[PDB]
Design a protein around this ligand. Structure first.
Ligand SMILES: [Th+4]
Ligand SMILES: [Th+4]
Ligand SMILES: [Th+4]
Lengths: 173, 174, 169
């Protein structure tokens, strides 16, 4: 259960002049990396989607949709704006048992095609982190996948902690 | 005495099709700046500034320019009133600007979430000035976009020494 | 304007001398003694590279001038590294103590950039040519302008010769 440490926040860029309206809608998880994310060849990770809706109060309603055990699973969360535009905290955190901390930081995006987002959580006093490569479609270029691999490794993650979920049709369209 | 490159006819200045006023709001950095009274100065190069567009209830923009000057943040506040067609504006309360008889704004192109080019024309002391700004949501833009902006500026009659790329800074505009 | 240090002039990696041969049109031309003559802008010329048995190039420049086709013939001898050349029989050029050629980049079948440096009367001249297999190029003109400026040259030292039909076809 030992973990690769979370990198210091100084190694995680923040998207300059983040546009919260432009970031909204559905994003597909085309890449996923983290200290508790592990490549499994026997049962490879299926792609899921995360949907961001801006509320009147500028927090996001965030719905994660996955296909799991023959069903569509839905996680509905609230992202509250954080210290800087492009950062978020999880709303009503006390209703998640074990969870003492949950940070979101958008690293880069061009809004209409791709994004990279960094997440850090403390759960049972264990510090987990992950990075998602988002696409507005289910596919992205080599170039972007490679940049995402390089960025994940710059945060201390080896190859086996970096996965490219297999596109599917169920639940996420 | 003043000698000015003439303003181009408006037919040489495109208009962004189906302009989305809500999407054009927020902060834009001035990454490129060209005009008949804009001059490159190597001794004291132009610092980057930002312009912030807020849509009002009545669809005019509140427009705030933020510059770093003499060690402080300077703030210019104006109003852009919608014009003949979407993407064009006039300056509100023009009589409070002494000498100013005319001021036109036309958004040439934008993709809203990264870049824009805006054309401005004003008549001040009966002198016809114009400029073009290359806007970015970030402080940097691609070669491709800078070159496009250079080409467009030249298509309106401006030589190289009337086209500048303000140097990125952190003070005031972050 | 001073010649830039050679460290600011790339060399084409793994230069293919056979593939570089044939006719190249001079679509761009820049240098510290090249000046836009705006009143009567310069005509395009061509430069033809023929590989000899001994791997030197026979290099023929063809211009249209005074109603005639003019021909300048020189020899480029391979230098320290593939893609670099020296001028052959340099001692027959009076005043010329040095002449270097360095191919900066090329894709062989469309475009190239070549850097030239010479010392003549103890004055250090340099120029850069943008070569095309055709008389027109794209993006590539802008790249050539930015490269020329990276070596210290302003806009007025960068020219785009006008395409013509006489002599160079
Ligand atoms: Th989770
Ligand atoms: Th003004
Ligand atoms: Th010569």
């Amino acid at each position: 259960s030992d973990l690769i440490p979370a990198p210091p926040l100084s190694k995680v860029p923040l998207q300059q002049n983040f546009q919260d309206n432009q970031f909204q809608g559905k994003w597909y998880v085309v890449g996923l990396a983290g200290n508790a994310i592990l490549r499994e060849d026997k049962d490879p990770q299926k792609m899921y989607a995360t949907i961001y809706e801006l509320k009147e109060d500028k927090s996001y309603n965030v719905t994660s949709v996955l296909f799991r055990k023959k069903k569509c699973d839905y996680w509905i969360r609230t992202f509250v704006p954080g210290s800087q535009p492009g950062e978020f905290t999880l709303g009503n955190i006390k209703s998640y048992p074990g969870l003492t901390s949950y940070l979101v930081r958008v690293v880069s995006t061009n809004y209409n095609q791709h994004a990279m987002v960094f997440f850090k959580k403390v759960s049972q006093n264990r510090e987990y982190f992950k990075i998602t490569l988002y696409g507005r479609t289910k596919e992205l270029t080599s170039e972007l996948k490679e940049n995402f691999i390089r960025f994940s490794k710059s945060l201390g993650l080896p190859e086996n902690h970096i996965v490219f979920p297999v596109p599917i049709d169920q639940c996420i369209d």
